[PDB]
């Protein structure tokens, strides 16, 4: 599963596909 982190504003999720 890749997953990366992406941060927005500060709040850093994780999306993976």
Same mark, same amino acid.
């Given at each position: /599963?890749?997953?990366? /982190?992406?941060? #927005? +504003?500060?709040?850093? #999720? +994780?999306?993976? /596909?």
């Amino acid at each position: /599963r890749w997953c990366f /982190r992406v941060c #927005y +504003r500060g709040i850093c #999720y +994780r999306k993976c /596909r």
